[PDB]
Amino acid sequence: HMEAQFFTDTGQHRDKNEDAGGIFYNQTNQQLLVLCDGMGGHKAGEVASKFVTDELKSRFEAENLIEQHQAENWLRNNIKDINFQLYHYAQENAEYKGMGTTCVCALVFEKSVVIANVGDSRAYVINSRQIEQITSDHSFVNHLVLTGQITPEEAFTHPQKNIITKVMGTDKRVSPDLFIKRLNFYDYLLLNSDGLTDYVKDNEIKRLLVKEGTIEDHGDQLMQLALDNHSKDNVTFILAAIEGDKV
Template identity: 45%
Template sequence: MKAVSLSDRGKVRHHNEDSCGVFINKDGITLAVVADGMGGHRAGDVASSMATSLLKEYWEPTSHINGPDVAEKWLREHINLLNERLYKHSQDNTECLGMGTTIDAAICTPTFASIAHIGDSRCYVLNGSGFNQVTSDHTLVNELVRSGQISKEDAEHHPRKNVILRALGTEKQVEMDMKTMILEEEDFLILCSDGLTNKVQDSEIKNVLSSSKELDKKAEYLIQLANDNGGEDNITVVIVQYLSMSESG
């Protein structure tokens, strides 16, 4: 397994409120994380950086993540703990009041990946079934699409496109989506902030992942595409590649 994480301020924002990381536990199992912060002043980058650094702190000492049930339980418990920490920090520090962050966190073992999701960052998988979005955006516009009130095409340009219905750290308790998938040799998992998906089509992301570029060059190229298309937001990408036996050997 190989993994790369990369975050870019973009071409318009003055600072980067995204955060990401790839962390390895005592057994060599990977945790991939993308967080897109929000809040007044610079509280957004406080929220996202706290999310990734605390998950790193929680993850690195762990071991015996030996099945999907254990992985999902770990994610649920520690993201709930993380939510409490962020919420308390916002209450104790007036400059951070109301801060929050999206979170996509994936425990990637050699045979499966368990993904926890809150907000509008996304996780996709590229495998034998094609390129598919694993997560569902927790946004007002996505709810309007799901209920049939607007079309997917309308959603692209909706004036309230950025309204998020669920975030980490904004309330005492938070709901998260959880999913586990079987992954095999040659599969890719990608976690990304909306700074990428608002500017780069799914078909383009698939083409980059399918290309012969080295893994770090794929991440760099995706960020370049988002910047070339305006780069109005911060852009963050984490790619996990499941290697064939010949590549991993």
């Protein structure tokens, strides 16, 4: 496990916080990082994001040991099952129909992390020289950027800029993206909702994290930066320190 902390804020421009997440431990104290952005454009976004977070917490705490070679399958299978359960929970309740959430999550190992992603929340690794986004946004504007139809600068003002193209809960099937990332030579692992990176640029995050400070120092400063940039969304992230391999 890593030293890690969860940070969330409703933001100045939202009535409710539909983001969710947490840092959970299984029976041998392995660590699972979870972050979910519940959909505000649809009903009951906080129900959906906390449904997925609660399910991942309960399922992970019931495990004794998930070794690195089992992690991709554990995450893929549990995300698919949770999506299935959430879809039918929504179908069975008219006030929830259409609800959904992103999910980015990470199982932590000594030398690596295994990440699953559905939606436009993000995972990054950062060191003093670079910041690498591990995940790829399942968003309509990312589709437009990757197919050459708009520039990445246009995506921030596009009328469909908040639309996402893979979401938990909205269909009985989902295909999460799975990533394995070696942690060697990185300093921080960051999971975040788009309320952060829609308003704070990658190089701003890198510059903040290369400064001295504890995880709580960095997280409070990073949260204040998103708010100073007038984020119009809920802002949530987990910041985790990667321990340099000792001599």
